[PDB]
Design a protein around this ligand. Structure first.
Ligand SMILES: Cc1ncc(COP(=O)(O)O)c(/C=N/[C@@H](CCC[C@H](N)C(=O)O)C(=O)O)c1O
Ligand SMILES: Cc1ncc(COP(=O)(O)O)c(C=O)c1O
Lengths: 411, 411
């Protein structure tokens, strides 16, 4: 067989396995080949299940129709996003926090922004992450060449600061033990633990970043699930404007997981060590590596940020929060230590004396329910399993009845 | 002012100026301040102007409506794209060329794929580009760290092989003079020259890549504009499957510039020097750095690849080809050497003994028509101006009458 003389990217070689979520999808698919008539309930991947509200879909359909008319047709959009959408995001989520329309960059989703930010930061920065956390932060770091190899003793990529988050520390790290890095990826409410940082904790985080001269990338993808009275934006913390940016999405708010619309906010006062504004480099990346979010998706997002849109999103969110309560109650009644579920649409269940992959496989084989192994979220996730609350009500109820039946005589 | 201690990405510092098209927008705005009553006609950026065909927008509106129903709702899609869409692309454009559904990756656009491919290849590859060519190839290369500094004497970034395409070589590189690189970006029909490589030329290109052990990234985003009997896909050349991938888009075919939908094809036989299949690394990038194209945009693209959709796209393309003929005839009658136009919806006009930025400024100043200076596409573009044929018919006719008024005394 012929091979080129092009050397494979050594950063790709570093990755220890495939990306987590397609591996879960693969295992689900394998299970269905084994048992074609299994009534599988999927609570692994955090995939929304309920329909998008009609007020929002009607806006998208209207835009689609408009694109077939002379007056209503539009081509390329500004890569940063339509001005009225940037304005709506700025006022709805950041009104009173000193965020301008020009500080908002509309994306086709938070996952995509994480990687474009990583291209922007480049190969020479060091990163810190919560341990456990959503695996895109670590994997994008590896891809960009910010890391060393995977160390199998500790299950960590070299040169990444893994900030230990545990039940005993309330899932917020002891910052006195955290080494200095250039970037700190911080998710609140955290995926997978569900932990929402308090105002006091976020104040610590901003103070830590300021003293270390670090940039915080704050992922607020689940913030509208907040029930406790905690900040939903990092910009609620005075001084955050000098050290932080925020990335978020409509995925979990409007069921836009397939529609694709999010945003990143980079404040004017966020500067590199040479005084160059970080937002100006992000703008160059967005203008060079991207051609903007879909015009139909943008029209949908604009409809979200209206009284009817916000009401509709609130209802969807509330439904999933009720699902979460059902799941918490099930695992609590079975005698497990259960974390999260208060401020986020997933629950974080401790399974002592078992590997999380083994628990995942057992649950899938015996109950035909898909979950996510905690170790997929980093070494601090070992011994835990994440259960998503996204599902039709009857599916959540059925999954819980299956869990109870499996575990009630043990557990 | 507070500054972080994070160093600006030194690859971002290498960039000479902003991205070309935002720079043109800036000059258009300045022109409007100078002439507030000017009736500006834009033939600069290749932005489609005519409405999307109803058969296609109807499918998109239908998908939007379906998302508000239990049965019709879908959340995350596989990052690679819906299987029926992958299948439709593979058969419609590559049937008989040995391309499988699994070799096709659906994107939110060709521009985005260029940069995801560059993340995949990484910082250690060297690239070759046509000179002139679409500026994203060079700029993405600089951003990824594949280059040295910009040299102002020659107007080139160090470490890029600029393959000069000129009237004297029929706008195809003299490959015997081209140095070996890892990657060869090759656009046919070329943007900005309009030149479509012949079967013989593409055969030379594949042979060159095979002997050098290079990967060709073949950009076919204007291939449906082909009028001459030339190959529309690199995979028409036997052996291409060992050295080439292809990237394309619906932007210029269906007016999807704002809708966002393209694809990349990477064949099974394309391997790195260690035998590792390139498609497997692209798949990792697509699954880690992307969350899939918009579901509504995918529904639109599926509708394009039907008898009614293909007929509709043919009509759209035919309209722009007629605009192109109007422009060609205008410049030819004025005594200019006009290139391109035959196989692409833009024309490449030779303005010898002038700087292209000066010609751009002159045309904009005197006729209120925006064009694109050739030097924006690299140093080989100096002395030419690209004129886009995307416009309403009356706007094309008017721009041409303005050109005739400006240039009547030149020949
Ligand atoms: C903290 C956090 N940030 C960003 C995202 C992705 O948001 P988006 O691209 O806007 O849909 C997510 C989504 N995570 C889901 C969905 C994972 C599968 C999806 N395909 C993905 O890779 O994001 C999960 O953890 O189950 C997230 O948790
Ligand atoms: C040659 C070429 N490639 C790629 C693009 C970007 O295409 P898309 O609109 O799908 O992002 C353009 C415009 C182009 O002219």
């Amino acid at each position: 067989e012929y091979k080129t003389k092009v050397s494979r990217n050594s950063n790709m070689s570093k990755l220890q396995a495939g990306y987590l979520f397609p591996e879960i999808a693969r295992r689900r698919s394998a299970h269905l080949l084994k048992y074609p008539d299994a009534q599988v309930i999927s609570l692994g991947i955090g995939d929304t299940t309920e329909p998008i509200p009609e007020v929002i879909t009607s806006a998208m359909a209207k835009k689609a129709h408009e694109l077939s008319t002379i007056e209503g047709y539009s081509g390329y959009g500004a890569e940063q996003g339509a001005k009225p959408l940037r304005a709506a995001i700025a006022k709805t989520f950041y009104g009173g926090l000193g965020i301008g329309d020009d500080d908002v960059f509309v994306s086709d989703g938070a996952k995509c922004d994480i990687s474009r930010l990583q291209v922007m930061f480049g190969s020479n920065v060091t990163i810190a992450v919560q341990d456990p956390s959503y695996p895109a932060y670590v994997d994008s770091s590896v891809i960009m060449g910010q890391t060393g190899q995977f160390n199998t003793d500790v299950q960590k990529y070299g040169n990444i600061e893994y900030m230990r988050c545990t039940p005993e520390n309330g899932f917020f790290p002891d910052l006195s033990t955290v080494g200095r890095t250039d970037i700190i990826f911080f998710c609140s409410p955290n995926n997978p633990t569900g932990a929402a940082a308090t105002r006091e904790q976020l104040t610590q985080l901003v103070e830590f970043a300021k003293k270390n001269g670090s940039i915080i990338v704050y992922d607020s993808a689940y913030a509208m699930y907040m029930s406790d009275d905690n900040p939903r934006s990092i910009f609620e913390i005075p001084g955050a404007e000098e050290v932080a940016m925020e990335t978020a999405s409509f995925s979990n708010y409007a069921g836009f997981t397939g529609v694709r619309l999010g945003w990143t906010v980079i404040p004017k006062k966020l500067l590199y060590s040479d005084g160059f504004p970080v937002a100006k480099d992000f703008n160059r990346i967005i203008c060079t590596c991207f051609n903007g979010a879909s015009n139909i998706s943008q029209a949908g997002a604009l409809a979200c940020l209206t009284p009817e849109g916000l009401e509709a999103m609130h209802k969807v969110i509330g439904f999933y929060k009720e699902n979460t309560n059902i799941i918490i109650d099930t695992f609590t009644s079975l005698g497990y230590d259960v974390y999260g579920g208060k401020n986020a649409p997933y629950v974080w269940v401790h399974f002592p004396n078992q590997s999380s992959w083994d628990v995942f496989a057992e649950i899938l084989e015996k109950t035909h329910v898909v979950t996510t192994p905690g170790s997929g979220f980093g070494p601090g996730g070992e011994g835990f399993v994440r259960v998503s609350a996204f599902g039709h009500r009857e599916n959540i109820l059925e999954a819980c009845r299956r869990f109870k039946q499996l575990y009630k005589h043990h557990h």
